[PDB]
Amino acid sequence: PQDMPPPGGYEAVQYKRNLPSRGLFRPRPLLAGAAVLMLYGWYKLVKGIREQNELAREKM
Amino acid sequence: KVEVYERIKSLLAGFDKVNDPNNITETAHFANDLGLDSLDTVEVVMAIEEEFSIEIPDKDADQIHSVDKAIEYILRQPDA
Amino acid sequence: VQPTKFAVTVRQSRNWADAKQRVIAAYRAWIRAAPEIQTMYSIPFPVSHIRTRIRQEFERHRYVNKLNVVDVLLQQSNADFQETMNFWRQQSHVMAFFKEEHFRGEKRLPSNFITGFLEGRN
Amino acid sequence: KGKFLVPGAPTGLTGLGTHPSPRSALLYLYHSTLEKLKQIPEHSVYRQSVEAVTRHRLALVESVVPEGYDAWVERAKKLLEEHADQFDPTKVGPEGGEEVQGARAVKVERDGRVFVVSRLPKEEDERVLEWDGEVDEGPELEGSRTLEEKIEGGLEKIFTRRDVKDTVGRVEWEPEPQLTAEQVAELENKIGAGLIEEVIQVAEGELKLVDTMVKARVWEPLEEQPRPGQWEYFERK
Amino acid sequence: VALPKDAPNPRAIPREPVGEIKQALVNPADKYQSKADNLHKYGAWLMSCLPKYIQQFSVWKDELTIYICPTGVIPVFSFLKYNTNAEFTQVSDITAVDFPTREMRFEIVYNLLSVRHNARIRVKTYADEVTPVPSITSLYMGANWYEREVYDMFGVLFVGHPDLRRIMTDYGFEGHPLRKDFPLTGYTEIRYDEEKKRIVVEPLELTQAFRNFEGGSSAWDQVGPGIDRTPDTFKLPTPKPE
Amino acid sequence: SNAVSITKKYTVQSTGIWERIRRALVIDPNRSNGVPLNPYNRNPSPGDNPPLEYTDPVTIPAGDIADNPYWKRDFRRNYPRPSVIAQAQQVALLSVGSAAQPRVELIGEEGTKALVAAEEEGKEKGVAKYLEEKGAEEAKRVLALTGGLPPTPSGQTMVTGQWDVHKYGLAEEQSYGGSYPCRSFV
Amino acid sequence: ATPAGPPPKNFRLPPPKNWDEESESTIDKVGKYFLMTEMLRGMYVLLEQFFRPPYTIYYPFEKGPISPRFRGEHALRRYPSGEERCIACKLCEAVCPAQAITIEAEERADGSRRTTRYDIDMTKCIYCGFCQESCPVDAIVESPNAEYATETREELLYNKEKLLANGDKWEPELAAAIRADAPYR
Ligand SMILES: *P(=O)(O)OCC(C)(C)[C@H](O)C(=O)NCCC(=O)NCCSC(=O)CCCCCCCCCCCCC
Ligand code: SF4
Ligand code: SF4
């Protein structure tokens, strides 16, 4: 015979724009994250430079 | 005015299409006197043009048919 | 010259007084331009040879007594002028207008009967 | 909210923006077209074709009337009558004046009908507008100057122009009421040629063709016959 | 290889056998008779509205052609650009055809499109080696380069055109290649000259001469005369007997 | 959404722990990687497709042995001619009508000489002289052929069965939604 | 610009929305600006490719796929007997789109109709395959060989001694490709 389609036809293929929104790139979870990172870092820095200043008092 | 003749006069002396030198006067006509053709005129005026470092417009170049007309155009141009 | 530097809108000569005015203005521009053509295209000829050769190309059509024939011959000139004054033509096209830069040279037809016979029609 | 079309809002077609007054523009163009058709003889099919089509569209345009139109037109009739010299093309030019920062109108007559062409000063941001938009011709010539130089500098315009705030001898021309956005849609469903703004583009094309159709006298007999064997190709038999 | 597991082999599926295939015979010209009457009507209306220039009109299938005087170019294209029933606002193509057996060698063919009416129209005029044609770049900006091609390839000259220069050929090229007297391989060839250090231009020699197999055209005509297909609305009424 | 499951997409799949890893750290789990399947794609090659399986078909009318004379199906030699009408022809058509619709009965004799009266006037005078001299009354008649308006040109679709413009309308569902400056048209 | 008849239902755009009519929270709008979230998504798609198999083929050890209909360099074939199939009809010379074939024939010593010249300008040929569709004896074919760059273009003037040598070389593969595609020809 010839090259013909299957008896019931081929199934539908995906052709529409899919592009699904992910939480990883939405602004609200990222804004919250960047903020907690800077707040944790600012707590760690405020403790370190206090200790550094006290080490300097002992050195002097 | 004596120079603008002297430089033009020697120029036509070397121009070959001039029928014969010594026919060059203050009022010499390019066609009647010198026997220069319609396209020999343009060649002459171009030599007239370049020697004095000025560009002749078409509206003015069509007027340059006699030597005296050539003189009165070059005097009117401030540069030389 | 709106679209290009040396563009001229295609015009049809109104009469012989007009048609001769345009021819003379065409010849004037070409022989004016000969120094500018000789430096850009590095033509190894005198400006005088260029000008005398420009004259020949107008001397070919001196006996045209048709006004419709002059306008096409004028448009051809204007277009040639535009492509030469803009550096659009290559040195190869320009110095190929001089018919002595063939390795056979200007002498390319046989001179008379006998010399073309001994060479097989040149 | 959406009762009226924003003027100059995009239509969907790029470069074509919503007409400020679509109905009167179309009426002006049709009547102007009908007036130039009298330069053409009656027996030309061109004129009959343009006349019939133009009158057909002119009838449907006039079929819709903006609300308050009868009320507005009565005031506008009087407002023209008592202040005619304010809107006269022979007095204030084809433009309604030279003070482009002020309102400009002119009464124009076409084909037994009266129109006012009002040109409105452009709405610009106050943060960018210098001198309320008064055009800058440059500085005045100062110093020792000649009589001729002062004239070419515009000095005689002192005794002609007016302060834009100077509105005592003048009256404000009030614009015509517009169609609604739904009325415009109904106009479109009658004429059957797409968007109203796109119909004005075609309509002002018919106006320009009459000038070329008269200059060329297209109704005159054939100029150049086909000489024999001109449109003959390669047909057999 | 990890198979998709719910995407089976599309080749493994068996196909329902096709037996006797039957196709009706159609004459593709027959689909165009329903519009044959209006295409004639539109061409008849056009030449009554512009009797000064429209010499004739032809209709082949879906194509209406208008034949015009060369001096009518600006009026005719204006009417076909700015008429409300002739809203032909695109030039699709302008080209020439050469007929050296005619006194006017060149036929100028314009193809126009009306997006408003989903319609096409062809306009034909004529030109010569010296007889110029009006340019229509006053009406269609897109026609500018087309006329440069017709000029470059045929020598036809377009009065009014801004910058009518060559568009296709080389800069010092002499000749018009689409002319039927112009030879296929031209008259000149180029090469690099070592002794001159540039590319030079030479008279044409071909290592193999071009073999033209035109002589093998059938001694017998193979198409015949065709069939007349004019609407009865554009035929002359016949005189009934008695 | 618009996606269909990866399991129906005829690409190589990730398996086991790597499938769980992929379906976690990936934008769209239903997206394929574009790698085709060896047991399915171009398998077998066209060089191993059996020569004897394929059949070159004929259709019954044109390919039969017993009920088709070639000259019924020679549509190349039944090609339409171009139908040409010049200015002389249209003068006659307006003068005396058309085989579809005559202006005069043209019965027997003294109608044949009226049929050249149409043809003779056509050569002598264009459609322009003809319209000038019989007045603007028959300028109205040229439009009376198409109902009093000029005719509009023919469209080129026939999807509705009649030649017409295509009715371009907005599709029911837009592919970008209103979110992008691009509309979809059906 | 739109078709004749009624304008399309809602062809005209809606009126434009002012900035404060837009439906996008300032938090979402400002975050997407400063965090550059859509650019972050695209960089993530390149990480996805990084961990996918490449498409590359190691050539010349692995070759790309070619069909039985492939159009490579020409060959002149024989019969099982050993006689050349070519009988000098010149059909392949008439149909050549680029005039790349030059054939001179005469009567062979035994009276058979055979070519004396058979040249193919491999630098004129467009590899259309027309020459092999027109053959009545399958004499001229195009082998699947695409790897024959040469040094001089004199090597690209195939004469009848090279085209027969090619057919002798490539016959199994030529017979195989013909066997696959003959039903469709
Ligand atoms: P005088 O009155 O004697 O002559 C004036 C003319 C010549 C106008 C005649 O009176 C006349 O009427 N002759 C017929 C009109 C005529 O000359 N027709 C043609 C004019 S156009 C023409 O001749 C163009 C020539 C070629 C232009 C280009 C020349 C230079 C090209 C190459 C330059 C060098 C390489 C870049
Ligand atoms: S190869 Fe085939 S087509 Fe060509 S000359 Fe020989 S028999 Fe004829
Ligand atoms: S494939 Fe080459 S040789 Fe064969 S017909 Fe085509 S161009 Fe000529």
UniProtKB/TrEMBL annotation, chain A:
Its main location: mitochondrion. The keyword Transmembrane applies. It is found in: Mitochondrion inner membrane. Keywords: Electron transport, Membrane, Mitochondrion, Mitochondrion inner membrane, Respiratory chain, Transmembrane, Transmembrane helix, Transport. Transmembrane segments: none annotated. The keyword Cell cycle does not apply. One of its GO terms (cellular component) is respiratory chain complex I. Signal peptide: none annotated. Belongs to the complex I NDUFA13 subunit family. Complex I functions in the transfer of electrons from NADH to the respiratory chain. Accessory subunit of the mitochondrial membrane respiratory chain NADH dehydrogenase (Complex I), that is believed not to be involved in catalysis. This is NADH dehydrogenase [ubiquinone] 1 alpha subcomplex subunit 13. The chain holds residues 2 to 61 of 121 of the full protein.
From TrEMBL, chain C:
One of its GO terms (biological process) is response to oxidative stress. The keyword Transferase does not apply. The keyword Transmembrane does not apply. It is a peripheral membrane protein. One of its GO terms (cellular component) is mitochondrial inner membrane. Its main location: mitochondrion. This is NADH-ubiquinone oxidoreductase B14 subunit-like protein.
From TrEMBL, chain D:
The keyword Iron-sulfur does not apply. Pfam families: ETC_C1_NDUFA5. Its main location: mitochondrion. This is NADH-ubiquinone oxidoreductase-like protein. Keywords: Electron transport, Membrane, Mitochondrion, Mitochondrion inner membrane, Respiratory chain, Transport, Ubiquinone. It comes from Chaetomium thermophilum (strain DSM 1495 / CBS 144.50 / IMI 039719) (Thermochaetoides thermophila). It comes from the Eukaryota. PANTHER family: NADH DEHYDROGENASE [UBIQUINONE] 1 ALPHA SUBCOMPLEX SUBUNIT 5, NADH-UBIQUINONE OXIDOREDUCTASE 13 KD-B SUBUNIT. One of its GO terms (cellular component) is mitochondrial inner membrane.
TrEMBL record, chain F:
InterPro entries: NADH_Ub_cplx-1_21kDa. Keywords: Ubiquinone. It comes from the Eukaryota. This is NADH-ubiquinone oxidoreductase-like protein. It comes from Chaetomium thermophilum (strain DSM 1495 / CBS 144.50 / IMI 039719).
